[PDB]
């Protein structure tokens, strides 16, 4: 009935038994002490114990373990942690007893990366783990950039799509209930999938501190208890620990991301962390243990000024449900009659509307019950709400926020903060910018657990680590190449068209793509290009080609714009024909390796081959010619040439996978040539541009994007102008990993490169993000 001697353990004394209220009667007593406040004078320096006392200043308190944080500093002449230079930490520094070095996970809502360059003369503490730690300037968070779906992605490694938590607030149809920040409805697990890192932890024999807090318990206090477990003997003290602030977050809705006003709760999270690693020096741990300072996501100028309103657009929006704001989800309280009543009806519109199978693969945001079919994507600095009265500001006339968040994760004001500091971390180092779904396999490696399948790629973040990293090997293949000669008579092909090898080894810069799945297919070479092309699907799954500098684009000659010719290579049977085409009334053609890039008139003949053909609506021609004739070249020529692949994507069911032959549900009128879903294309050069992209010696650079294979251009409301003003923007909005185009083929790209393997597997979780 008393919480006496289990304060905090790891009726109910524990760190949540406030929640949904459960405690012991005594518990804000035994357990929540205040007396003094926080920190020790010079007053009360080696005190008498008072056991109403917040924290400790009696010389008794190291043995007993009750501290104040800064007790050795004012009590004991020694100096704050923050004032002793960098020390490199090169093996922990752990009691004898310690069996891993402990990790204590810092999170901060709605660090803005930026907020870095306020400097130490308000976030000294902060400053001192990012210069004598690893850092990188950046975090990507996932989309939607809010708390919720971005910290369960932290400690999931998962996309939200897959761990379940897609927003803050969500309905379940198969629940028939809704999720919200408030209320106790988050509580009922039923709510979460994949495996958190508690629990990774807690199911491998690794002990997990509580992570969460009740509202009511003092950022001082959660500080307090992390350091008390600490002292905790061998066989009970947790190795993983976290804390977590909801500020700078509450401070940048109120006054925006730029107030003077930020600075304030800046430095209160700045003294909490100093409070921390005071401790953890007054306990000598501060050489022991790996410390994560991690945001959720950043914070954008939004004013109530900036709204888009349904009501603008739909007759009546008392018939439909919006989740509102920095995004838009749309349910019923038709579907593409919605949409097309959303799609493009002001000049500059600030949100455009999706069926969620149709936004940019690179946000992997539709493979759940709980994703509505409608959604919005919102631009930066706008808001989007049912109608006016939605929007409410104070008495005053002012809005009652001036900041916010939840948009397109590549927005440059969203991206949050990462620093690592600790035995395990590389010291004074700074790392390429990276995805937060990387981080579990990180805390996993720091704690010596098996990471549960998760959406990072193993072994990417190697870098970061002096030590304790994660040896990728990479797949074996699982498909190998036939390499077929002459086979077939030019007169053996039905197919109803018309038409009036290791020098090609400087088009395969970095060996063979290896195809993981079990099919056949064969390598095809040309003068201009290399391809793998599949008898399964009748396309290639890939097309290899090198572009110099000085590259010179042709056109397609006026007799041969409807020229296709048979591949005598291929069985007519495993080769597309002209007669599908014709009678499909909807669908074109188009071509991998571009003609318009031909190396001589005698060469283009090859690009019109049967097997360089992939079907392609109209519309969508409109963009790959403008790609293939104008942008390739452009590349090239800025970049010093460019190694292109490009290739079709099958994922009717949007799960981010290759769809197998069962799962495609469209091909060419009355054939079996399926139709893609989208089209990728990865383009590769020297890092050093002073290099061809054909003899480059060191790193590489890459850009990737998978773009949907549409029947009309409705998403590029400019698409009535010139090309030259809407393709690329287009292009830009559908960038993507390699690593995701990886996923949606089958496919492993760069086996043979200079490089080592961890080197490349960071090259393919690069997303240019423009
Ligand atoms: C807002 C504050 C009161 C804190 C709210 C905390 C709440 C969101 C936390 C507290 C308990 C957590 C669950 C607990 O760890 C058990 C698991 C098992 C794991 O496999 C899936 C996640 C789950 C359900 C945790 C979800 C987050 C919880 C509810
Ligand atoms: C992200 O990672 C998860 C976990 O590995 C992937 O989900 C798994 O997908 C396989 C194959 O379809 C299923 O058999 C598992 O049941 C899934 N597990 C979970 C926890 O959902 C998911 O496919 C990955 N997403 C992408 C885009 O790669
Ligand atoms: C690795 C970065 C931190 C991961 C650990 C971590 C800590 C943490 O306190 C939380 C995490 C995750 O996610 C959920 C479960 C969504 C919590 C929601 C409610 C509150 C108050 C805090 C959140
Ligand atoms: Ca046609
Ligand atoms: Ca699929
Ligand atoms: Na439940
Ligand atoms: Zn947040
Ligand atoms: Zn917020």
Redesign the pocket.
Known sequence: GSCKGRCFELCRCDN?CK?YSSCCHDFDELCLKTARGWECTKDRCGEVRNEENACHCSEDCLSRGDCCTNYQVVCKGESHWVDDDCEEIKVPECPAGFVRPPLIIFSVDGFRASYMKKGSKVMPNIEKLRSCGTHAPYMRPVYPTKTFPNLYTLATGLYPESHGIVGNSMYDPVFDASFH?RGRE????R??????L??TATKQGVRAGT?????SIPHERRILTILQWLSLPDNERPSVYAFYSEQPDFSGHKYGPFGPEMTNPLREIDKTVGQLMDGLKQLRLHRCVNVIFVGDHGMEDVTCDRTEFLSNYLTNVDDITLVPGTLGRIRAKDPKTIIAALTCKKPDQHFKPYMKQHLPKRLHYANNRRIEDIHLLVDRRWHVARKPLDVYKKPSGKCFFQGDHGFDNKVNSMQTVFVGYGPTFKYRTKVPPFENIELYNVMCDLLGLKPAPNNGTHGSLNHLLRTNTFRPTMPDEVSRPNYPGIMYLQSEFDLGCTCDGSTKERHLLYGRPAVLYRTSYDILYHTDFESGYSEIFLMPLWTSYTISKQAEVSSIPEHLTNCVRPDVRVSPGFSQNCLAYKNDKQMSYGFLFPPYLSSSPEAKYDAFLVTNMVPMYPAFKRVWAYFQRVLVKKYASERNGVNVISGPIFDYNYDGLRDTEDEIKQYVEGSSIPVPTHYYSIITSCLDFTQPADKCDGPLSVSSFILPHRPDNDESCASSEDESKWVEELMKMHTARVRDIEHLTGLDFYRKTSRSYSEILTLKTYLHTY
Do not use: A
Not at 186 to 189: E, G, I, P
Not at 211 to 215: Q, T
């Open positions: 949540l929640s920040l988050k509580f009922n697990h709510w979460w999938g994949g495996q958190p508690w629990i992570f969460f807090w009740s509202v």
